[PDB]
Amino acid sequence: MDCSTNISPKQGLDKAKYFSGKWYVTHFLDKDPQVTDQYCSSFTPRESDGTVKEALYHYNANKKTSFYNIGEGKLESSGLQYTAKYKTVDKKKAVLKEADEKNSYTLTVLEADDSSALVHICLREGSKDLGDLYTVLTHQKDAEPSAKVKSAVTQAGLQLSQFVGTKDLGCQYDDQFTSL
Numbered sequence: 001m002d003c004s005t006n007i008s009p010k011q012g013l014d015k016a017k018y019f020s021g022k023w024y025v026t027h028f029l030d031k032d033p034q035v036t037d038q039y040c041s042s043f044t045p046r047e048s049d050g051t052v053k054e055a056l057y058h059y060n061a062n063k064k065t066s067f068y069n070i071g072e073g074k075l076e077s078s079g080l081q082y083t084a085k086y087k088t089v090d091k092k093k094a095v096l097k098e099a100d101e102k103n104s105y106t107l108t109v110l111e112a113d114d115s116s117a118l119v120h121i122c123l124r125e126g127s128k129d130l131g132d133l134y135t136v137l138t139h140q141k142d143a144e145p146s147a148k149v150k151s152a153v154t155q156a157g158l159q160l161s162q163f164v165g166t167k168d169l170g171c172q173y174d175d176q177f178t179s180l
């Protein structure tokens, strides 16, 4: 199941509302039904003169394990969207493995406001796509997304009822890692 070819970023988004603070995934939709594990994630994206770099955390709620990454790439000219290469780091941001240039993720921002955002992520590992992933983001763990971001979900052709809510999963975060 490949990622969709019909994803595009929202025009006119203030990139300032996106590349701010830290984000927590409050709700996610993975289109591939062959997955079992559920995750929590938080990340801190930053941008300077067209270059994006972000510190990323995942917690596998089923296996009770976590992993850390640093992603980097360039903003597209055309809207709020980037394809990143990523390295694997430990919790103090020391590099464990440098980026495998055959892997990447493309992150497309569909909405962003002062409290909330909606993004699409297509993760590719060599030939293989992990399929569409949509994530509703908030700055405050277990907060509700804004009405604007909830509208963006519907306008993306999705239904919020179909997303997994992470606030109930028993997430463990590393707020040290995502702060600054």
Ligand code: HEM
Binding pocket: 025, 028, 030, 038, 039, 040, 041, 043, 056, 058, 067, 068, 069, 071, 086, 087, 088, 105, 107, 121, 123, 125, 130, 133, 135
């Ligand atoms: C709750 C939300 C999310 C879920 C359910 C999720 C799901 C997954 C899964 C299943 C994997 C493992 C793929 C594999 O086994 O090879 C993975 C890895 C990865 N995800 Fe996420 N993801 C989430 C959020 C994000 C976000 C927000 C980003 C980027 C901003 C992202 C980027 C990545 C990257 C770079 C990896 C590869 C990690 C590595 O190989 O070291 N994910 N994700």
